[PDB]
Write a protein that binds this ligand. Structure first.
Ligand code: NI
Length: 341
């Protein structure tokens, strides 16, 4: 049944709750972003109001064929009324179209639902600075102190420098980048920009990217693989067998593959710096795992929460085991005693 951490008290609303059938008492279903564990259940047969960003609404119409009459896109950073309740959508710094949602309950309670997010100090100057938040529904994906990772900027500088050096040393090398969802577009777009190429990809992935309102996108991507020297493949294909196979397909145009797997966290992060990352190599194929995250590190999460000073935290991730729930509750209490709220 629908878990309590997907329901907004004092309203008829749910958040990211499309896989439970008709949730009794729900008058409006919000969707924070277009990732499959969150939209699971939606299709052209859905007949209740969906509230989302404009980009998420484009993906629902074009990829899932949800009918237009049930898609209710909202602008960001704008007070809107939904079924009698004031709401605001804020940029979550996750994937394209991802939002956090502020609910202003009739009784005076204010609720923030982060959806999935990567906390940032810029959020401390949004509409969140303007009133107190009582309850926080928090993306706790990486809520443990082992989870450190570099800035997105540091990771893209490493990728651009590695790719540019490899292709200038060997003009017959191909660059491949893995993907299985929206998000992390800066990785393949920044590498193609430094090389003077478009990114080549499948018709399905090209359609997805054309839903994202990314400026000048027609200048950056293509379905013509032959003209491109940065290719996107399914993340599953980013291994030695899948890559050797791909290289056969290119008909002797290339003699070397340099591949990137933008993972979340990997336990080389506890030891190794970004400067010190090395690939796995077999023959003329090399694979780099790069720690490009679209979720908060531990420290980023902690700063946001100590700034916000909520009265109550409701975790939305890692909630399925008693040891994970107890560990997170211990960190929340540490943060509150340290900061004095
Ligand atoms: Ni997500």
């Amino acid at each position: 049944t629908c878990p309590f951490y997907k329901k907004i008290p004092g309203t008829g609303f749910t958040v990211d709750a499309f896989q439970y059938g008709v949730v009794e008492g729900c008058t409006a279903y919000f969707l924070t972003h277009f990732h499959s564990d969150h939209y699971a259940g939606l299709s052209k047969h859905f007949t209740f109001p969906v509230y989302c960003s404009e980009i998420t609404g484009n993906l629902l119409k074009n990829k899932l064929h949800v009918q237009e009459q049930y898609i209710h896109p909202l602008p960001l950073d704008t007070e809107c009324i939904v079924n009698g309740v004031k709401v605001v959508l804020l940029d979550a710094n996750h994937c394209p179209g991802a939002v956090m949602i502020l609910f202003y309950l009739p009784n005076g309670t204010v609720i923030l639902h982060t959806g999935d997010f990567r906390a940032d100090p810029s959020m401390e100057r949004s509409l969140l600075a303007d009133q107190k938040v009582h309850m926080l529904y928090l993306d706790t994906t990486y809520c443990s102190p082992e989870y450190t990772f570099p800035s997105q900027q540091e990771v893209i500088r490493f990728a651009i420098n590695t790719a540019f050096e490899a292709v200038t040393l060997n003009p017959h090398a191909l660059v491949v980048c893995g993907t299985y969802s929206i998000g992390k577009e800066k990785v393949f777009l920044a590498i193609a920009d430094v090389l003077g190429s478009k990114v080549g990809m499948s018709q399905e992935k090209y359609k997805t990217l054309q839903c994202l309102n990314i400026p000048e996108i027609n200048s950056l991507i293509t379905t013509d693989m032959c003209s491109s020297l940065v290719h996107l493949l399914p993340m599953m294909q980013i291994n030695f067998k899948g890559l050797q196979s791909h290289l056969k397909k290119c008909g002797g145009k290339y003699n070397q593959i340099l591949a990137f797997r933008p993972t979340g966290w990997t336990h080389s992060n506890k030891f190794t710096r970004i400067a010190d990352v090395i690939p796995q190599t077999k023959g003329n194929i090399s694979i780099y795992g790069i720690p490009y995250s679209e979720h908060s590190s531990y420290l980023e999460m902690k700063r946001f929460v100590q700034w916000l000073k909520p009265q109550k935290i409701i975790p939305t991730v890692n909630v399925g085991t008693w040891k994970s729930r107890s560990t997170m509750e211990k960190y929340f209490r540490e943060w509150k005693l340290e900061a004095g709220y």
